[PDB]
Symmetry: D2
Subunit: 327 residues, 4 copies
């Protein structure tokens, strides 16, 4: 029996005896991702280069891919009538949905992650995290400031050689491959679990002169193994969604610790770190800042940053031990 | 006026006063690339998972993406009636085309480059190099053993966030974006030239323990600039086609030198090194093994490996200086 | 607010306080239609003509469009776990779903209507009707033998210049246009109502010598108006879904009465007549055999045929009056 | 070997020893057809309905399908650098191409034929006729006023259940099916020939009251065969391109004679009648006005109308006999 993402969310909704609001929300997300994907692959770009001349746009209507993605998510999610608060990396303040379309969910998301790889056509994606409004007060930013451990659903969509949507909820992580021919996400990996120990480390070594002693010692250990084993291979795409996804599928470790330019790390806690940390833990992986669990951080700024180390259990604990040793 | 790959090729053929054979060859290459791109993006995957019943071959009995790609290239190229000899990474010996479909061209290619990035959906692609048959004796593998300097055309197709074909010939490097909506490649950047110097280095530091003194010193400079300037950023996708394209567009340097386990490097000369070296020089860049120009090497085996250092002229020259610095 | 078919069925399910089974069923239908559509437009036909040579099919695997459509519906519907009895024009006996996937719904359908227009690429489509099992007995064909008036949902998908899915339920008829770019049906026509009187008649006049006096008199009246007005224009595609859809959108009348070859008419009652009759009546139209309401016929054969006249109110009643006059 | 429209055209160009100009023209025509096909199938319609926000132009402010199609043809054709004069159904006067893009060919076309079938999603298409500029004086409308007999190439693209392009030149009629999956037209039937006699007649019997005695008698024979053979079946889609294609493939006859409101017929000579007449004769069929060959008419206005009767030789000849029968 083939299983589409649409059949899956609906069924999981039924098993949970939900009123259907979250389902309608997940369905919206699915539609948003397909639209972003189609745009990312440059469908209709011939129109930009005047295949039909220059007459359509009566004015100056053009939009950067990232901006368009942001508009797709915002509109699509709002039209689901399931959300009350939206947090986008593209907006300085949280977006409070009008009462007429207000729902109980809070959605934090990165509409198009990996901006530095956009112009060079490297894999990019969309990241998201979903919370339930924990309050009775007027909806506001505070409703977005919950620790990751409270997430009800999280995941991402990877626009690589092929497009894949990975969804994590309380009962596990599932990966669905997008069949562009019929516009359908097909479940191809069910209760996904990450390998206990990998053979690949992922980090931008250009910041080498700014790394702490723990990170420095660990990287050295990956190149010159004390047990004289084969050193880990290195891989760093530059796009979090791509590096993180390979980590889930192949195992290993991904890191983005603090440095001069980023004493609190670079990546955003609400719509980058937490979602990926939740996916990792649901797959039996770990996600730490080096000192604490990412999902346990109670945020105070919707755009707050956080250091992050995630991936295979044994790999992450090995680094955690280096941190504990130096302490 | 909008320019499609098809119009471009046809015009370069009329200017060159070609008989139309090379044009048919490039036309076919273009068609193959599109077919590969569609399979890579997973159109029709739902059928593989029983969308229409007949769920039995669910395992490992249907063509793998790399095999399908190889089939497309070989079949499409033969059907152009423009080739006599074909060299594929997936085939131990050179393919000698039937006398009935025999043409004057020789093609070396990598049907799907970046095999390790396939399962994690990281960017992958196709690389090609075209030679004009010179000798008069029956076609053989010796016909594909010419130095890259004799290349008539070379390039690649990148299956990334979007698909792009990069073609380099005597008078330039042109990039064409594929519009999947109409199955048309659109010219989006004409006579491409790489920047004199970049701020990104690309190499698998995993073989640090195996690197020669020159590479080791160069990397040291990128992380700890002696003049105290800003350190280069690091990027290593793992697919040559993806790392090389970013190099062409953003500038910088890409490296795969020889390591213990790979005394003569890892990358293949005929269908990986030469094509990329040809694209780089035509763009004003450099491609060296650290001691000689890649394009000058006289191949002795169609699967011969060779070390390669390519990218921005100033960055490549700096490493060359280090190589000669170490005598 | 844009509305996808997926959001619509889900919401209509919520408003009805259904357990979600019918929704999962409607969602399945939606997926089936997209797959059939993609096939009808000939996606991947290049593989049939050996663009990748001849190596994939280890044997002789080819399928006629109609057969494939049938397999898509059967499998897709069964995988919804919402049906117990399926009736296809392609199967002599009703299909009783296994207990493991058994649901409460009975589905009658024409997987690919308009077979005579297939080879000439004329518009074709899929027709469907849905009933709820009215019994406690073991599921069987009888469960499919309910009069049209009992339908819970009916409609069709038209594969014409563009693909459109028209869905009718108790509270009205809605048309959704398929956006192939993102694989999404977009609601573009809400509580659709047919014009009270049209200006187009649709019938195969090749059977002229076999028509009854009523039909003959009516056709004459359409060409030579007694009130001396402009005669109706004639239109007959040859595909019921196409002729019927134009009738809904433009108004007018569609007819397929009995003749020598078909004393009980040609069209099938369960998966051709009833579904279209239900759509017509929900749009304020009429559907008669000339003597009685199509939806009131209690069938005794799943493959039973019925004469049918449908379309605008005034047009159909005018013919009904001719029938009553001759009586 | 699989043959694409692109390979076919390029080869016919090499055989004909053409300079490559007509080839570029056909290459462009092919690209235009694909772009039209994608718009007709409604890709990206979700954007028109606010999928990404900006819901204000929802009404009648964006280009209609017929206008967009016309823009594509004109722009794409000009950009081929192969034409000097263009005649479109949508333009009152002939388009004289700028001297900078001027070529030796003249093109008459119907951007989107079957306007009345657009809103009901019935099959529609594009028709074209290509002439070689002969005179030496400045290009003008007179250059498009040559009898169809001088046509160098003519044909059409049918946007039906699937999209197909039919091209007719001096040595034959070939049909190519469009594979939307890769944006490639595949040759599926080479030197096409219509059957000597069909069993289907196509005409709008709505103008029965206006038909001349010949047509009236012929139709009588099709419904009430004097020799008591089987009556012909009737089919009338309403889009010339759709009715003519079925005629080519299934055989039979298509008719649009002159009626009171249309003393000189309805269909246009330059871009409807001549192209279809050219395709029919090259396929062994006939195309008459009832008194003369369509292709022999010397046009006096680029929007001149003309009666037309085309199809299987025996069926057309029988009607011609009736015409001369009535003196
Ligand atoms: N589609 C679903 N998948 C998983 N859990 C769900 C789903 N729908 C509802 N739930 C769970 O049920 C709760 C209430 O759902 P709702 O009434 O739709 O807001 C959600 O917050 C989830 O914990
Ligand atoms: N489409 C083309 N683009 C660029 N150069 C071409 C093209 N066609 C032919 N040439 C040049 O002309 C030579 C002979 O072409 P041909 O007669 O097709 O084998 C080629 O080796 C190229 O150097
Ligand atoms: N998506 C829906 N749209 C319209 N009516 C629905 C829907 N879902 C359920 N219903 C109605 O509620 C009944 C029970 O639904 P269920 O419990 O899903 O079998 C159906 O037979 C319909 O009458
Ligand atoms: N691709 C082609 N297919 C068929 N005939 C062609 C083609 N190219 C050129 N011809 C013939 O050669 C003539 C001159 O071609 P050209 O030099 O391109 O204007 C045309 O008018 C055609 O009769
Ligand atoms: O260039 P740097 O410092 O490695 O930053 C790359 C990181 O920044 C981001 O682009 C920010 O979202 C991530 O996708 C990626 O992990
Ligand atoms: O794992 P490694 O040794 O870095 O290999 C990476 C290289 O291997 C390849 O996949 C070989 O084709 C290249 O695409 C890539 O540059
Ligand atoms: O050739 P005939 O007798 O008009 O039959 C055409 C009818 O048959 C069908 O193909 C049967 O489904 C209908 O779609 C169409 O209305
Ligand atoms: O409604 P009528 O008079 O039959 O017109 C039908 C004809 O009109 C057209 O739409 C005119 O382009 C043709 O495609 C078709 O043959
Ligand atoms: Mg980001
Ligand atoms: Mg390779
Ligand atoms: Mg039928
Ligand atoms: Mg027309």
């Amino acid at each position: 029996n083939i299983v589409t993402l649409t059949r899956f969310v609906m069924e999981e909704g039924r098993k949970a005896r939900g009123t259907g609001e979250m389902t309608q929300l997940l369905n919206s997300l699915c539609t948003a991702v397909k639209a972003i994907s189609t745009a990312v692959r440059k469908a209709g770009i011939a129109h930009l280069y005047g295949i039909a001349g220059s007459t359509n746009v009566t004015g100056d209507q053009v939009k950067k891919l990232d901006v368009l993605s942001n508009d797709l998510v915002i509109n699509v999610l709002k039209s689901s009538f399931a959300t009350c608060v939206l947090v986008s990396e593209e907006d300085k303040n949280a977006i409070i949905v009008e009462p007429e379309k207000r729902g109980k969910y809070v959605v934090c998301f990165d509409p198009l992650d990996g901006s530095s790889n956009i112009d060079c056509l490297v894999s990019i994606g969309t990241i998201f995290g979903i919370y339930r409004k924990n309050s009775t007060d007027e909806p506001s930013e505070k409703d977005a400031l919950q620790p990751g451990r409270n997430l009800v659903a999280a995941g991402y969509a990877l626009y690589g050689s092929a497009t894949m949507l990975v969804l994590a909820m309380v009962n596990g992580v599932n990966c669905f491959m997008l069949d562009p021919a019929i516009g359908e996400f097909i479940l191809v990996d069910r209760d996904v679990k990450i390998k206990k120990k990998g053979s690949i480390y992922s980090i931008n070594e250009g910041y080498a002169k700014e790394f702490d002693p723990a990170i420095t010692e660990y990287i050295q250990r990956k190149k010159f193994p004390p047990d004289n084993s084969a050193p880990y291979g290195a891989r760093y795409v530059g796009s979090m969604v791509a590096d993180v996804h390979r980590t889930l599928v192949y195992g290993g470790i991904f890191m983005y610790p603090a440095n001069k330019k980023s004493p609190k790390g670079k990546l955003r806690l609400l719509y980058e770190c937490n979602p990926m940390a939740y996916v990792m833990e649901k797959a039996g992986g770990l996600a730490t800042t080096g000192k604490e669990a990412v999902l346990d951080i109670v945020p105070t700024d919707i755009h707050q940053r956080a250091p992050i180390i995630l991936g295979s259990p044994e790999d992450v604990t090995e680094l955690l031990e280096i941190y504990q040793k130096h302490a």
